[PDB]
Enzyme design. Structure first.
Site: not given
Ligand SMILES: [Zn+2]
Ligand SMILES: [Zn+2]
Lengths: 21, 181, 154, 16
Positions: B57, B81, B137, B139
């Site tokens: 993502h 993902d 931020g 991730s």
């Protein structure tokens, strides 16, 4: 699209250290 | 020894945009976790076993800027993902967790480490909840076991009125599965 | 300028450690006593003094950074010494821990006031005193971080 | 006499 760019880092491998004067 | 972390900024807004377009990045690389940016967003990428991994993502289909120009992804898995690139020269890799532990430690982009209890193979709860903005931020960053080995990658916060109670992560096993296909 | 959470600290007669937690610089009363701490603007008064817990606190100095308190409940701890060595201790009670691996007394000397860290690097307590058997430390007394938290609130 | 600060320790080992 533009590249993903490294803008910084997080270092997990440093150990406690006396800050040099 | 305990998990401790520091953050260093290596590049400002303007240098990041330029490097984004040329795909050519001459900077020295250090550390296990890279702070990573596109035009729209900034997140984390974690080096494990010689591969630099982050969230789809965030990176989508993009190349990574390197000293030799842009580098194409090695692994891509829209469903888990996940994306991965060869780990940049100079980085250091974490290794997967092989103890069985369920006490985890999430490392944020500000280099804070926060305790989480594993609640299933893709979720854990914050022992002590934080506002969602503390996690923005982060991730693609690592969940660590007590010995500092990699258990998973932060994917999304599970929250309630802006307060993070839990986190979804990509288990390190999903990484091996992605590597196989 | 990089900041430190732990300061190496001195009086005329000894040297020990202090640790910043929640904006306060904390150390052992048996070292600091009732003293002020030095600053480029002159001496600064203790914010907190608690003889019972062996605890003193000043406002954190320039060049420092606060440690966040432990809230996981771990009993694997790590003691940080004045030489920046780290020694694993197992938590035994709320004031007490044993070194996984005992050391000469001199190895721990000058480290009171230093932190005991959980596996996340958060503060569990402040090293109060070495527990000694014929020159070998095999245990430690410490001030649990809850006392610090109480002292502030009260 | 005051307590004086003779040095600092950075727990993460962050260099200058
Ligand atoms: Zn493990
Ligand atoms: Zn803890």
């Amino acid at each position: 699209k533009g590249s993903v760019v490294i803008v910084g880092r997080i270092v997990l491998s440093g150990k406690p250290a006396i800050i040099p004067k | 020894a305990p998990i401790t972390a520091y953050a260093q900024q290596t590049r400002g807004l303007l240098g990041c945009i330029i490097t984004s377009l040329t795909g050519r990045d001459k900077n020295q690389v250090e550390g296990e976790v890279q702070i990573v940016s596109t035009a729209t967003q900034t997140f984390l990428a974690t080096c494990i076993n010689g591969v630099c991994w982050t969230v789809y993502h965030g990176a989508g289909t993009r190349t990574i800027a390197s000293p030799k120009g842009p580098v194409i992804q090695m692994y891509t898995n829209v469903d888990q993902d996940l994306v991965g690139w060869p780990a940049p020269q100079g980085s250091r890799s974490l290794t997967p967790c092989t103890c069985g532990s369920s006490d985890l430690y999430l490392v944020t982009r500000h280099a804070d480490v926060i305790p989480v209890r594993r609640r299933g193979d893709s979720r854990g709860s914050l022992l002590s909840p934080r506002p969602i903005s503390y996690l923005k931020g982060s991730s693609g960053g690592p969940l660590l076991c007590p010995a500092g080995h990699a258990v998973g990658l932060f994917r999304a916060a599970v929250c309630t009125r802006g307060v993070a109670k839990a986190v979804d992560f990509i288990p390190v096993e999903n990484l091996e599965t992605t590597m196989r296909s």
